[PDB]
Design a protein around this nucleic acid. Structure first.
Lengths: 199, 247, 138, 190, 176, 109
RNA sequence: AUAGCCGGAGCCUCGGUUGGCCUCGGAUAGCCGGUCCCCCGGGGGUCCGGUGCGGAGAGCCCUUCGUCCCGGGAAACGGGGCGGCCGGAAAGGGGGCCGCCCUCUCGCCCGUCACGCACCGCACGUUCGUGGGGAACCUGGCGCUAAACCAUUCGUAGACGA
RNA sequence: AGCAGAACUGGCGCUGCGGGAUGAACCGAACGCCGGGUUAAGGCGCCCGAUGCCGACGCUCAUCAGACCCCAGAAAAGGUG
RNA sequence: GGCGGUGCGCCGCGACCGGCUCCGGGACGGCUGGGAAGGCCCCGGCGGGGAAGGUGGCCCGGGGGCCCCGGGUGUUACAG
């Protein structure tokens, strides 16, 4: 009932356009690993794209001007907000269903992350083109927690490896379990093959 | 049109919010960074301004006109009584910033530090930390205190210490001590935590923290001057005498 | 590295189109993104069909680059692609999909009932080996 | 247009023992092991032939620009073969008009001290790239000799000290001073 | 003329109306590539009005019919001559194509010229399409397919049907 | 013992870009994403279930707080599996993005 | 620091929903899983199998009409009752393990016996739901006997507040 | 010259509607109150109804890319991109 | 109780008929160049030719070592 989308390898505008439509349909979408979001075009193109965005501020009072968010999660939150009717009541009610996170929170580390193949770099971009990581772009423009998130993301990398290697050994005993017991499960096995489930 | 003759602007915009300070005690916005090679030591201290006077000393700067000559220098006198360590605090480090992990105080806290936890000392019953000090004479309490200390061994990255000044030795009218987190910079987390555990309820003199001929930083609140115009606050040009609505 | 190559005589599986789900054999390459192809034994008339809707298999039957439809059928029957394709694990999991698709609601109930005790024996079998391992682990 | 297939086979000698995983090749042999990555080009690397005597690259449906990048792989793999068989010896002169350019090497070929360059009080300190050995040869005064196995690292470190000794705001047509690359050779000959 | 869909070859003949001066006018046949026969006869009178002193009022259509491909299952090489219009000046070309049908090669010619030189179909005057042998081809793009042992893989298979599994778990595999 | 209706989301009214016609509702039934799969749901009865403050009667049961707006599925909309529906009373805009039920008892099978 | 914590039924109000997936990393001119014959303190290397992913999200797990007996298959380690023990810190679980006094091969799959308003064709049915909040009623146990503001004073402050 | 003065016709003035982000003159189309259907001009990644087509063929990398009449900005020349 | 008329208190359902629409599934026929192509009858049979995107066979080279990859001649040879 809650969409947990992994942001690694996902294009900024293609993911935001699909999330914005799903969020407006009453679906709670949680986007995770926003530092893995990457944008087509060379890195130097996107930097001045964001640096000239920084220059756009209110002259008389910059505190009332555009709030330039530097975190990768809030940058992705900004581009979804521009894809939504946030000036209306239903637009702001939609944005409450969106939840962005840098790295992976402990609420969402022990969960399966969904992947949008339509909003993917490997699908929508030619292999000879250039792309820019949002995580590198954020720290290079004012984000202070890239190395902070990298070590905490490093910490859960072997912690899931322990779970996965235990998971393989857990189902290695499962796959070996049929190997001793075909003589008394063939009654259930063949009817699962006539209907096409193990063939 | 453009300005006829160029001139730099009055007042820096880095100190733009010229409001009354929300705090009265100086705050360390950025503590010195630490490396594990150095031993554990204090990085900040809290003093009180007394007055100023002259000094006479020899200058030993090569290549100057004033080399090997006697000078006078304006020097501040800051009376710095030793602190009493009353607690420690641990900080886990998050992708959203720096977050406090757990605060562990002493068994018994001196009444000078107890002044801070009350807006009105006269009407209060002085009941602060009365049930917290009951945790140190039960066997479940000591195991919980060691479990809290062992938790800070694993997860805490930055460890500060809670120490307060001593108003009894000062001639000031007030008796309310000022609490302050002081970052302990030194070796790894484990020996850093053991050093602060030993220093609990102990006198901390100035000589442990600072030394002579050493660059330090002074943090404090400016002298109050009240509501002021642009001529006093911003040092703008006074208008001529012939102005009608003021100059 | 690549193991399947678009070349004269490779048997291919059609992805989409009116002839989807059938086998077909490459005769000649017309353009960069289109090839002349002929499924003489799989009810696929000689025509041009692009690379968009074909999945190329590891089956190669040899005939000249512009041989007529008579020799393609003879090479298809000599190699006997139709029997070997059904023995491929590719087609075994292809044909299981419509078995799930045509599965009747009554057939759906019998699968669910059979899945219950089949998992009961495996879970009971797995349970015996986790406890047997821990005595062997100590 | 798109060229349907382009290739260029690299014949390797008996002393070099190459192997590849994915798109990264490794080159080992007498003088050590060299590794270089080629993930930026998206080509096919095929090591066929028994007794592994040649390596062939491939690029299907390539166009004029990237087919030019097919050949520079053959130059790069051949340079890795040369550095493992015979290495790379770079000899650099020290040209000075009046002030003798004093040179001395600290920590065994990883750091260069350059003193009295144009009579400057400043001392110039250049850090050599890892894998590069630095020393002064014998039987001639003005030589600084760089040793190594990778052509990228040795020639970059040669260009580090060449750019470190430049004459500022002067007529360089008259002021001809600095440390410049003289001879580009190998460690051992055949 | 709108180059809509695939083109069709039409064999349109015509002549002048009988006059008191001339008993039977000569008959003129052309090869016209057009989507339908209604626009083929309009295109027929366009070129005839340039070559001869002919108009549609003084002329008539004797036979308007479509000729079919004689070998639509044989891969062939087509030589196509151009008379397009640019923004500055008009130019002639010779372009080579490889297709099963003559009308398909003209269709491939119309889509290629608009892609390269941004030339519209009304600015393009086709004149001659001729079957040529493989050994007489000139452009290396066409000649690279003249191989009895042609062999190539599909290196980067751009996967389609990307939205039917709009949200999935496994990272998709662009390699087969 | 379980669900007998397909999950559908009231995406919005049948509309233009600057004009909406709130007498016809657009439905996004879960599982259908093409025009040719919308043929099964044509003619099915749709209902929007909601609860209010005052208690109203319930057919065959004690009067509850729940209320419905009955309607039917008219015809397919768009190309990507959307569909139109028409109710007796026009749906309130509070139901935008909320779950409504489409039932199967108007069955053609 | 707090003049509330644990466990039973009824009434108003707020509303949405109609089974859960408990997780490697990562590539896309490449992957996945096992054999380890090999080398060191988990990695590398080799081999074997799949690769339009079937150790597949085009997927997996649970499945519920209920009660009474009897017979067959599994099961004897197993289903369910309390205390600890540790594993969790990036925004942290009633997660697992040790022994307990009672429980049955009752659990589940096949087949026999019998019963269950069979409300006589009709709608918001069917859950998450001991859902959140609020008064009042329950029963007992466990407990705690505080601060802020005004006033006055200070003057490191100040138009008044602060 | 969004300047002044003429010829034919159509519009605004006197006129709402859909579209061009907006808009007196542009495109389509003119109006009693409604239901169903179908279109014009325009469009169909999100705002925003509609391509979530297994869309076809090619071109293009910009460290100032480009994106739809009216229309809202550009030239001569040069480029071994 | 039966027939005719009006209506059901409220919430609803179904059936058939007619009108206006959108969509789907079957079967039949006409024209062409009286379709073009295409399939089968040994390559449909016989005779005569031609080159190439050169199949056997020959030569050279390289990879194990008995098949594959290149280059050259050729006219069906064990493919076309």
């Amino acid at each position: 009932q809650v969409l947990v989308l992994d942001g690694r390898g996902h294009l900024l505008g293609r993911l935001a356009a699909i999330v914005a439509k799903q969020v407006l349909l009453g679906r709670k979408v949680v986007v995770v690993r926003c530092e893995g979001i990457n944008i087509s075009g060379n890195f130097y193109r996107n930097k001045l794209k964001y640096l000239a965005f920084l220059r756009k501020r209110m002259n008389t009072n910059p505190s009332r001007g555009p709030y330039h968010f530097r975190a990768p999660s809030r940058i992705f939150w900004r581009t979804v907000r521009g894809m939504l009717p946030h000036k209306t009541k239903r637009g702001q009610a939609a944005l409450d269903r969106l939840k962005v996170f840098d790295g992976i929170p402990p609420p969402y580390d022990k969960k399966k992350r969904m992947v949008v193949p339509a909003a993917l770099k490997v699908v929508r971009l030619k292999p000879t083109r250039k792309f820019a990581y949002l995580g590198r772009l954020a720290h290079e423009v004012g984000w202070k927690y890239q190395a902070v998130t990298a070590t905490l993301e490093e910490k859960r990398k072997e912690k899931a490896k322990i779970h996965y290697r235990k998971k393989k050994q857990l189902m290695r005993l499962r796959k070996q379990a049929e190997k001793n017991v075909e003589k008394k499960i063939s009654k259930f096995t063949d009817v699962l093959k006539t209907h096409g489930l193990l063939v | 049109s453009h300005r006829k003759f160029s001139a730099p602007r009055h007042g820096s915009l880095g100190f733009l919010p010229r409001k009354r300070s929300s705090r009265h005690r100086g705050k360390v916005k950025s503590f010195p960074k630490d490396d594990p090679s150095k031993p554990v030591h204090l990085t900040a201290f809290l003093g009180y301004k007394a007055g100023m006077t002259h000094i006479v000393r020899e200058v030993d700067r090569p290549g100057s006109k004033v080399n090997k000559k006697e000078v006078v220098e304006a020097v501040t006198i800051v009376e710095t009584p030793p602190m009493v360590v009353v607690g420690i605090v641990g900080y886990v480090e998050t992708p959203r910033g720096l977050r406090t992990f757990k605060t562990v105080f002493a068994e018994h806290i001196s009444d000078e530090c107890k002044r801070r936890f009350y807006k009105n000392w006269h009407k209060s019953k002085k009941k602060a930390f009365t049930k917290y000090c009951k945790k140190w004479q039960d066997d479940a309490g000591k195991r919980q205190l060691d479990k809290d200390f062992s938790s800070m061994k694993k997860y805490c990255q930055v460890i500060r210490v809670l120490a307060h000044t001593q108003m009894r030795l000062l001639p000031l009218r007030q008796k309310k001590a000022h609490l302050m987190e002081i970052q302990v910079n030194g070796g790894t987390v484990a020996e850093k935590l053991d050093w602060a555990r030993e220093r609990l309820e102990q006198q901390v003199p100035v000589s442990q923290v600072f030394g002579q001929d050493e660059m330090i930083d002074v943090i404090g609140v400016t002298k109050g001057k009240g509501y002021k115009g642009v001529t006093s606050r911003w040092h703008t040009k006074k208008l001529p005498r012939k102005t009608h609505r003021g100059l | 590295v690549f193991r399947r190559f678009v070349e004269v005589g490779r048997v291919a599986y059609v992805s989409f189109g009116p002839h989807a789900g059938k086998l077909v054999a490459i005769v000649d390459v017309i353009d960069q993104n289109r090839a002349l192809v002929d499924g003489p034994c799989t009810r696929v008339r000689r025509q041009a069909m692009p690379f968009k809707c074909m999945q190329l298999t590891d089956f190669i039957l040899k005939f000249p680059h512009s041989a007529r439809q008579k020799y393609v059928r003879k090479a298809w029957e000599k190699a006997d692609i139709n029997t070997k394709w059904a023995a491929t694990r590719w087609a075994k999991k292809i044909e299981a999909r419509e078995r799930k698709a045509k599965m009747t609601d009554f057939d759906r109930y019998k699968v669910m009932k059979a899945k219950k005790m089949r998992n009961r024996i495996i879970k009971n079998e797995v349970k015996k080996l986790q406890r047997a391992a821990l005595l062997k682990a100590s | 247009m798109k060229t349907i297939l382009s290739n260029q086979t690299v014949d390797i000698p008996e002393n070099v023992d190459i192997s590849l995983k994915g798109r990264t090749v490794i080159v080992k042999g007498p003088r050590g092991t060299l590794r270089r990555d080629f993930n930026h080009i998206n080509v096919e690397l095929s090591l066929l032939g028994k007794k592994k005597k040649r390596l062939r690259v491939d690029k299907w449906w390539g166009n004029r620009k990237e087919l030019a990048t097919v050949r520079t792989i053959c130059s790069h793999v051949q340079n890795m073969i040369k550095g493992v068989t015979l290495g790379f010896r770079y000899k650099m002169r020290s040209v000075y008009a009046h002030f003798p350019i004093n040179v001395v090497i600290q920590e065994n070929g990883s750091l260069v001290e350059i003193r009295n360059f144009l009579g400057e009080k400043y001392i110039r300190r250049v850090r050599m790239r890892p894998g590069v050995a630095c020393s002064v040869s014998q039987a001639q005064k003005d030589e600084l000799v760089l040793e190594g196995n990778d052509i990228e690292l040795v020639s970059n470190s040669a260009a580090l000290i060449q750019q470190a000794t430049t004459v500022k705001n002067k007529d360089i047509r008259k002021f001809l001073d600095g440390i410049y690359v003289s001879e580009k050779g190998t460690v051992q000959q055949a | 003329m709108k180059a809509s869909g695939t083109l069709r070859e039409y064999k349109v003949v015509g002549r002048c109306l009988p006059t008191p001066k001339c008993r039977t006018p000569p008959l003129y046949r052309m090869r016209i590539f057009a989507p339908n026969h209604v626009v083929a006869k309009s295109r027929f009178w366009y070129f005839v009005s340039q070559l001869k002193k002919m108009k549609k009022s003084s002329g008539e259509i004797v036979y308007c019919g479509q000729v079919f491909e004689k070998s639509p299952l044989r891969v062939k090489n087509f030589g196509i001559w151009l008379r397009y219009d640019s923004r500055s000046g008009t130019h002639n070309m010779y372009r080579e194509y490889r297709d099963l049908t003559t009308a398909g090669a003209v269709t491939q010619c119309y889509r290629d010229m608009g892609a390269r030189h941004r030339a519209r179909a009304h600015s393009i005057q086709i004149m001659k399409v001729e079957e040529i042998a493989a050994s007489k081809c000139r452009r290396p793009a066409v000649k690279q397919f003249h191989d009895s042992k042609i062999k190539f893989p599909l290196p980067h298979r751009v996967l389609r049907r990307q939205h039917k599994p709009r949200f999935t778990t496994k990272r998709p595999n662009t390699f087969f | 013992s379980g669900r007998l209706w397909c999950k559908a989301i009231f995406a919005g009214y049948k509309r233009g870009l600057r004009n909406q016609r709130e007498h016809t509702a657009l439905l996004k039934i879960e599982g259908v994403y093409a025009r040719d799969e919308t043929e099964f749901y044509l003619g099915k009865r749709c209902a929007y279930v909601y609860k209010a403050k005052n208690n109203t009667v319930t057919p065959g049961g004690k009067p509850n707080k729940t209320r419905v707006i009955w309607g039917k599925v008219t015809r397919a909309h768009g190309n990507s599996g959307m569909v139109r529906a028409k109710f007796r009373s026009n749906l309130p805009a509070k139901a935008i993005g909320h779950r409504i039920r489409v039932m199967l008892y108007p069955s053609r099978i």
